[PDB]
Design a protein around this ligand. Structure first.
Ligand SMILES: Cc1cn([C@H]2C[C@H](O)[C@@H](COP(=O)(O)OP(=O)(O)O[C@H]3O[C@H](C)[C@H](O)[C@H](N)[C@H]3O)O2)c(=O)[nH]c1=O
Ligand SMILES: Cc1cn([C@H]2C[C@H](O)[C@@H](COP(=O)(O)OP(=O)(O)O[C@H]3O[C@H](C)[C@H](O)[C@H](N)[C@H]3O)O2)c(=O)[nH]c1=O
Ligand SMILES: Nc1nc(=O)c2c([nH]1)NC[C@@H](CNc1ccc(C(=O)N[C@@H](CCC(=O)O)C(=O)O)cc1)N2C=O
Ligand SMILES: Nc1nc(=O)c2c([nH]1)NC[C@@H](CNc1ccc(C(=O)N[C@@H](CCC(=O)O)C(=O)O)cc1)N2C=O
Lengths: 269, 271
């Protein structure tokens, strides 16, 4: 019978399924539900469908997963909201790419940077009917480095999410894990509608904040930020004072300071 | 000889001037620079001008203050931007109503609540030519209570600022005080343009955030926010789960929950 279903995408889903096959369950005991963006082609992330094809793993529908008693249903960047009443099993888990209760919703590789954070986290939690609302099983908090981009932060969510899965999965399989209700205080949420991918920079902001408005949108597979109709590939912040409210466009880079006058180099594409 | 000027308003300016007359200088050694808004009347805050009237303290201008060699200039919610160059004295100080380097700029009783903070602070710093950018002498960090309004947070800035001013004034007079470069990391700023007093609430937010979007604007002397064209006087965030995305108007209050399902009681204004 199917003991475990991985729903989702990218190296966190593929590498977690690989860990299951080596340590826990046989191919005939697992199933996948790939994301709508999965066409079975490895690119800048591995395709869960391509892995399932190579490893003789069955694809199932959400409708089928509902009917499988005792299934461990694990979302690793699954693209769909499930209704937990529809499942016969109550063994429903998600890895969320933020330090819950902060930064529920989407674009979590943008929202912490854009909102001036110096740390983020990955959080293993029970699925309930809300978005990212379910009881916490485990959390790992890690730094946002001062010149990290959304892409760097994303790759960190991928590696820390994969680590936290491997840590907890035996205890999930043995039903010997605790869960804790999320706090109401410090709970925060961002929907697709809350992020403009073509963000217009506000320069009436600190250097840190102008930096953050650039680097939060550096994720080349999706987009790069533009200054004066010119793509930016990298932003570097230093504590060097060059004066307040500077803007100097050179051939290959902009030099920028905000209200507090610290040096930003925005590298052109 | 004027040794010390207090430029600004409200109980921080008045009670700081009081403590100066009480422990450090005589009336003839001190002058005030009031805000454009000061019409010598006590209300929800005391009037600096009214205090200067009662205690025979002279009003000076900025132009006067610039020429006063050796003067200690203290901005306590002063309304005027100041160029350091213009001053004979380099003993220019500001109490800023945030935990610098965060929440430089304006409406610091609103911005931390609206941006989901559970702490704020008061920072005593040297004035430089930037907005709240100058080197830090001392800082007191205090909690934003879960149901604090912007008024509550402003009242805490006044009390903790008055305390920080008192704890620090001696070493400012002796000129035996340290200052420190503000970090560039975690530096943030809001200008007046960045706050829409009348911003519509986004209900596609957590209960904490809907609660914050109401209470950040509860400050009755300036405004109350509204839901369905009724003014709200208090918001209360509970830990009670009532279901995701609830909204119910009752006679005296709105029952609201966000994307995480916690009950908020928003109390209506009621003549
Ligand atoms: C779609 C998109 C993504 N990105 C970046 C920032 C995003 O955080 C990151 C990941 O994109 P994404 O859509 O895979 O993920 P996120 O939007 O981070 O996560 C949501 O969607 C996932 C598929 C899951 O359903 C998850 N539970 C959701 O929170 O890629 C862009 O910069 N521009 C874009 O237009
Ligand atoms: C003007 C105004 C103020 N308020 C609240 C929030 C503010 O933080 C608080 C105090 O307002 P305020 O006019 O004193 O100014 P703030 O914007 O707090 O402070 C600026 O102006 C002061 C006079 C100083 O120059 C200070 N350094 C500045 O940062 O009252 C409202 O809720 N609505 C309003 O319309
Ligand atoms: N019930 C449930 N809770 C979850 O936390 C959860 C699941 N299911 N399933 C897997 C994963 C799904 N994550 C997401 C998160 C957001 C959207 C999404 O469509 N967001 C819309 C808002 C839609 C709405 O308002 O209902 C958007 O515009 O952001 C989709 C899937 N997940 C945990 O990761
Ligand atoms: N040089 C200096 N630094 C300071 O930090 C400082 C002073 N002077 N003077 C006293 C006080 C004045 N504070 C302020 C702060 C903001 C505005 C203001 O109207 N700001 C506008 C935009 C100004 C700009 O863009 O340059 C706004 O809309 O926010 C006025 C007075 N102050 C420390 O408090």
């Amino acid at each position: 019978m199917i003991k475990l279903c991985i729903a989702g995408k990218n190296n966190i889903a593929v590498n977690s399924l690989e860990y299951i096959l080596k340590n826990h369950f046989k191919p005939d005991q697992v199933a996948v539900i790939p994301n709508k963006n999965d066409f079975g082609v490895d690119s800048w992330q591995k395709s869960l469908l391509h892995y399932a094809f190579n490893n003789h793993i069955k694809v199932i529908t959400l409708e089928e997963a509902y009917e499988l008693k005792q299934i461990i249903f694990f979302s690793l960047e699954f693209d769909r909201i499930v209704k937990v009443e529809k499942f016969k099993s109550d063994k429903l888990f998600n890895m969320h790419f933020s330090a819950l209760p902060k930064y529920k919703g989407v674009f979590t590789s943008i929202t912490p940077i854009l909102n001036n954070e110096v740390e983020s986290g990955v959080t293993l939690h029970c699925i309930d009917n809300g978005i990212d609302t379910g009881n916490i099983i485990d959390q790992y908090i890690f730094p946002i480095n001062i010149n990290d981009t959304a892409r760097d932060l994303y790759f960190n969510y991928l590696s820390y999410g994969e680590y936290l899965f491997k840590k907890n999965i035996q205890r999930i399989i043995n039903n010997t894990y605790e869960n804790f209700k999320q706090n109401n205080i410090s709970s925060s949420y961002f929907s697709r509608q809350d992020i403009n991918i073509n963000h217009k920079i506000n320069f009436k902001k600190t250097s840190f904040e102008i930096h953050n408005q650039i680097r939060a949108f550096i994720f080349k597979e999706y987009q790069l930020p533009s200054i004066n109709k010119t793509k930016i590939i990298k932003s570097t912040l230093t504590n060097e004072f060059i004066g307040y409210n500077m803007f100097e466009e050179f051939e290959e880079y902009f030099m920028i300071s905000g209200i507090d006058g610290f040096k930003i180099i925005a590298q052109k594409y």
